[PDB]
What we know:
Its cofactor is FAD. GO terms for molecular function: 3-oxosteroid 1-dehydrogenase activity; nucleotide binding. It contains 16 helices and 20 strands. The protein is globular and about 75 Å long. The longest helix is centred in the first third of the chain and has 20 residues, at 99-118. By secondary structure, the protein is an alpha+beta fold. Strands 1, 2, 3, 6, 7, 8, 9, 19 and 20 form a nine-stranded mixed beta sheet that branches. The protein has a domain at 292-459: Flavocytochrome C3, Chain A, domain 1 (Alpha-Beta Complex). The chain has helices at residues 8-12, 30-41, 57-61, 72-76, 83-94, 99-118, 166-169, 182-196, 249-255, 274-281, 331-341, 372-378, 387-394, 398-414, 426-430, 505-522, and strands at residues 6-7, 19-26, 46-49, 124-126, 145-147, 200-203, 207-214, 217-225, 228-240, 286-287, 292-299, 305-309, 315-317, 350-354, 365-367, 381-384, 450-462, 465-466, 473-475, 481-487. A hairpin with a 2-residue loop joins strand 7 and strand 8 (217-225). The structure holds flavin-adenine dinucleotide and androsta-1,4-diene-3,17-dione (ANB). The site of androsta-1,4-diene-3,17-dione has 9 residues, from loops.
Amino acid sequence: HHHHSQLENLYFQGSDWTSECDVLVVGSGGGALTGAYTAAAQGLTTIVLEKTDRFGGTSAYSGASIWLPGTQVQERAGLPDSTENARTYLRALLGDAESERQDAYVETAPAVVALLEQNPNIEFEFRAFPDYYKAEGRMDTGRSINPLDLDPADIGDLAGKVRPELDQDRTGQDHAPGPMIGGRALIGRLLAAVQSTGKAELRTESVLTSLIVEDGRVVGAEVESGGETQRIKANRGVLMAAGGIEGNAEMREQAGTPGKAIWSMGPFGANTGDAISAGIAVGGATALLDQAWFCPGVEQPDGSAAFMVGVRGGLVVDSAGERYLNESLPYDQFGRAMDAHDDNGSAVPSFMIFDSREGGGLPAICIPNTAPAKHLEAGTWVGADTLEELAAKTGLPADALRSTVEKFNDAAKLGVDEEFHRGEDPYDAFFCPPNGGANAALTAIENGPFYAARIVLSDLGTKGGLVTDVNGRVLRADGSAIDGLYAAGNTSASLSGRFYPGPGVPLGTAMVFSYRAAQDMAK
Ligand SMILES: Cc1cc2nc3c(=O)[nH]c(=O)nc-3n(C[C@H](O)[C@H](O)[C@H](O)COP(=O)(O)OP(=O)(O)OC[C@H]3O[C@@H](n4cnc5c(N)ncnc54)[C@H](O)[C@@H]3O)c2cc1C
Ligand SMILES: C[C@]12C=CC(=O)C=C1CC[C@@H]1[C@@H]2CC[C@]2(C)C(=O)CC[C@@H]12
């Protein structure tokens, strides 16, 4: 499947429009469905194309934490925060680079939240999760909001169409027993809201392949559904919110993107840069293709990874058996530090070192969560009764590994880490239950057996793609808009550059620029 552009005139020699809509949405992530809702709610006929047999993509896997600050939702919680406070935080991290999109992000958040909560299927609440950088306007508790838990019965036939959590989806399973939470709830509610409008068609196994141009304007796109090709006309526009290049090893190697397709937490085979490709084919510029939403990943027997988040013990060594980062860093800064320290394989993989404090468990949240016994049969993890035997089994220098652990244990006994300042930040302390020691993030590694887990450079999607303006319009290298073409989420180059400012920025940006694209199409 290549994403070459089809000219209207050339197609007129043979075929014709299968269907017509005002707004064609490609993808069914948080952005896609927010854009679809915005379009359909104000009377525009809308078609949503999902490539796979399940709506939601990585947005479904998410915890549905959303960085939409200064809204009616944080007002109800009485949060000491504002549009201007969130605007300062972004300015302090990102600078003047993309300041117009920074302004539009923070200024439009309130309207996106107000439009969505109006729908009986949608309600959010503030949930504490710290912002990720020391800077003016940081919220030590967070300012991010989450959809309310959703009883799958309230949405009928849509619950079985929603992609399940990673602990189910990569083991051939559907939703696990309780309610829909995190991204399952975000996608269930957005699907039900889009459907409530009576102006939207929701399609599974409908793949975008090529955009249709007349006289340089996008007028529609051919979508493959069940062996047959269809030609869908879009009177107002095509919103492309179909994710990034995360699943395409060839586009990543070409762009110089660190990590690997097989380490991405995107749904296997889903996000293969189809929409970025179709956008370049009609003259769209690209930026930041070497950038991803990075995270450490626990290497799996099958060669894939698990998102390692909320670290609360252990330490991490490079291939010399030495600490080189604060292991408690927010996952994107952790991942960037693995890549920066990588000297042809000294940091990728890294080795997470831990003891039996958690009964053999690795001291973090791993998504998905493979059983220790499985990692040990497979050799992704190794165990031993001594650090000397552990260094032997991993090929780590034994004397260095022993010094590293003895020095980390002295730091745990003292309650400060001289070397990397672990535990001296509200993000670091957030995940840690009280221990009987001075710093909750620093626990002496001394209760046998001892484990070494392989850590790789995973991602939560790439963040490079098509250049967009404040209204989600796709731009050519010259700054001019391609008429009828919008992109959002990881189809579009993030305003965040080399930064992951706080929880919910991927979904928050996606939802705001999808809303703004719909509004621009309404005219
Ligand atoms: C465990 C986990 C937790 C996370 N938690 C959060 C969080 O709380 N908040 C947050 O902001 N971010 C979070 N993230 C990151 C976030 O999920 C993603 O970066 C973000 O959702 C990307 O959304 P998207 O719209 O770019 O892509 P997706 O949500 O993946 O949507 C893309 C969709 O487009 C479809 N598609 C692809 N190609 C085509 C095509 N050719 N035609 C039609 N459809 C196509 C795909 O199948 C997919 O369904 C988390 C990630 C993970 C893995
Ligand atoms: C770190 C995270 C991810 C990316 C992002 O952007 C925002 C968040 C905050 C919410 C957590 C989520 C990851 C998954 C978590 C840990 C859960 O399973 C419950 C709360 C979720």
